[PDB]
Amino acid sequence: ATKAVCVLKGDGPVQGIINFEQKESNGPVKVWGSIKGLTEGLHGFHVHEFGDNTAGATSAGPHFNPLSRKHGGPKDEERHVGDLGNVTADKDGVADVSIEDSVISLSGDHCIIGRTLVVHEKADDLGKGGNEESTKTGNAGSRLAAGVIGIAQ
Amino acid sequence: ATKAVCVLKGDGPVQGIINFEQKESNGPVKVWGSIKGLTEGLHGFHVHEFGDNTAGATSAGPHFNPLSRKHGGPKDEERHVGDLGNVTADKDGVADVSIEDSVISLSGDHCIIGRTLVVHEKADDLGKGGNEESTKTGNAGSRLAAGVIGIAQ
Amino acid sequence: QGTLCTLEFAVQMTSQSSVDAVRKSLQGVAGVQDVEVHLEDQMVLVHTTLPSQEVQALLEGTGRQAVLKGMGSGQLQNLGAAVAILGGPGTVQGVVRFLQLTPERCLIEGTIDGLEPGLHGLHVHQYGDLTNNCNSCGNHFNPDGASHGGPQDSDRHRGDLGNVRADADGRAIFRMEDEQLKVWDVIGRSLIIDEGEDDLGRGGHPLSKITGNSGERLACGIIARSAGLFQNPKQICSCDGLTIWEERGRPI
Amino acid sequence: QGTLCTLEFAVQMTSQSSVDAVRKSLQGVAGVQDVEVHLEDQMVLVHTTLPSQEVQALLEGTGRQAVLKGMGSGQLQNLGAAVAILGGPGTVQGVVRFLQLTPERCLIEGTIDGLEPGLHGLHVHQYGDLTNNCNSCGNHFNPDGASHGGPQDSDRHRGDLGNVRADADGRAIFRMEDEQLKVWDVIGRSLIIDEGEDDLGRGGHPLSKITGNSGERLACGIIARSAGLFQNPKQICSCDGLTIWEERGRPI
Ligand SMILES: [Zn+2]
Ligand SMILES: [Zn+2]
Ligand SMILES: [Zn+2]
Ligand SMILES: [Zn+2]
């Protein structure tokens, strides 16, 4: 898979479209898109382990973590594979997403295809807020909108 | 068993008789006897795990250690059950042994009956000589004389 | 790093001192996990990350010729599993689950509500692209370059799963096994249900050999990774040519 | 730690909220390892060091009647094993090994050289006191206060093992099973072989009902704890009412 795509949706007004592209085999992945309907400020942005959303974020489960580490920001050495940090939602409630990341992949053992991308309620504290919950979820709390990452043309 | 006895013997001139006595259930054990034929100075004095001397100290095996601890002197909290420290052999080569010890017993999980008592070549360093061998054997080295601890009248 | 398999070389071994020497060459070498030396078989199994070239040279460094005869990994794994949730404009909704029973047989089983009673085409499509409802999903999944067919045809699109029947109340319950479809080969692709019947290429219509003339695409989902019921196996004990594995079901 | 058995109480349990309450009383109390609650059986198994008094009071502290119906420990153990090495003043030397096959059946098997060919009494004696050669060892082992007998007699000394035959070259090879003798009950006692035949109490000698008139005691050893071929079992895996144990032979 060179390209992939995700369509975020939920119960609330949150919705959006995120693209992935990877040009080298175990190279970096460009992540880009838009999300309307958000509160202003920062929101957590995570690839969770499974794509099964029959039961919401209980079936999609935890942050995608094939190397059994603690939660962190994308720039940290100690992080989950799924940790892509935050997205900035402006005054109107739009976040123009743009990220580059070489820990996620579209192939191999860190392949995100078939897993659930999620925009969370609060901001990702990057594991630095200093408690048990900070090193699982970064206290971004509840799901706003989510979708399965699928293969794209 | 209230009383027990051991008859130490080898190929070389080392030989002796050690008695054990215990008056209270989980009480202390009086250990007393004599050993002739020793070099002057200090010699290690150990209850090893098994009494099987079909193959010497390889079949009798290690220091009797039901709590999987490191080797020590009798006075240490960290010790093998079998660790009774040293005996002082005089100029004539006799060690008149007299000891009290409340970690060995003649019953229960620390029962020494049926195991091999051994007088070793060098002195017991009490685990304090600072290497891997010091915390197995206390660098007392080879067996001089040994015998199975048996029930006595 | 380099990832570890188990390497099997065959060595002419006769005396216990030869075996002493073979173990000697791999005893505590950088990156060799475990060595095992079946002297009845005249064989040396090597649990290691290292390349076959390098490891053959260390055995041959003693002075014995070491012919490699196999590589394997006694790691065990679960059957693969997946789920697609179908949604779209309006009434049609459903869940379809996939389970790879054998590496040659996939089990598909699901439930789709809000269908105009009778037969509807069900197909795996190429892309998991829900950007433009079900029209962004591309064609029937067809990596072998076959012509469209029904599930009882050798020549067909991998993605061709034939039809499902909506009952009285507009609801399709179905189970099926398919031998060309494979869960590992469709994660991230899409499942789509259609307006009307797939003709299985037997319509003599221009679309027959291409879509089976199935109509508008009503509802689609992405074929998504699901947790199994069971956790990943765990080795609890090993020996020479034996491993013992535990497999516990998931909590919840 | 070492006093860790498993306690079974029977409790009137009906709803899942009652079971929630039972677990509640033992959830994280000092010194309770594991709790397990078969609601079909209306029963609560408690892996704990604590006394049965104390644990019954914690269950009854909720207000629920907790009748104890059993205790056990699913710890597993090896069959017990022992060896005696026979030496003395004179010519005679030998090794005799013991293995407790079943808790009712002991296997004795050994080899004794330097014997005047024919039948010799073999007996376990009371004390493992080798201070005065074989004469400090006391009588035939007789905790049940029986009269001396042969191994085919119910009324006999536990220590009575009858006779063994020294062949042509003055060597006795023998196997026997004995149902009254038990390895755990003779560790630290002595095995002794005799100058001549044990008459099995059928000699009409004053010693018949006491020693079987067997003669001088030639050689003796203490019945000593032996390592046995196999290591202590190890639990490798558990669940609710199942444990899996490994048992490996000793290396050397
Ligand atoms: Zn994380
Ligand atoms: Zn020691
Ligand atoms: Zn097709
Ligand atoms: Zn008798």
Residue numbers in the entry:
A (entry chain B), B (entry chain D): 1 to 153
C (entry chain A), D (entry chain C): 8 to 259
Lines from the paper:
From a conformation that facilitates copper acquisition from Ctr1/Ctr2 or Atox1, hCCS domain I must move to a position that enables transfer to hSOD1. The very high positional dynamism necessary of the hCCS copper-binding domain is evidenced by intra-lattice conformational flexibility and a 47.4-Å domain movement between conformers. Conformational plasticity is therefore not restricted to the hCCS homodimer state but is an intrinsic property of the activating complex. Comparison of different hCCS conformers indicate that the C-terminal tail is also conformationally dynamic, as has been observed for the yeast orthologue and predicted from SAXS data for hCCS. When hCCS domain I is free to move within the lattice or inhabits the extended conformer, the position of domain III is partially or entirely unrestricted. In the latter case, it forms the interface of a supramolecule comprising four hCCS monomers and four hSOD1 monomers in crystallo. The SOD1-like, hCCS domain II found within each complex structure has an intact intra-subunit disulphide bond in contrast to the yeast orthologue.
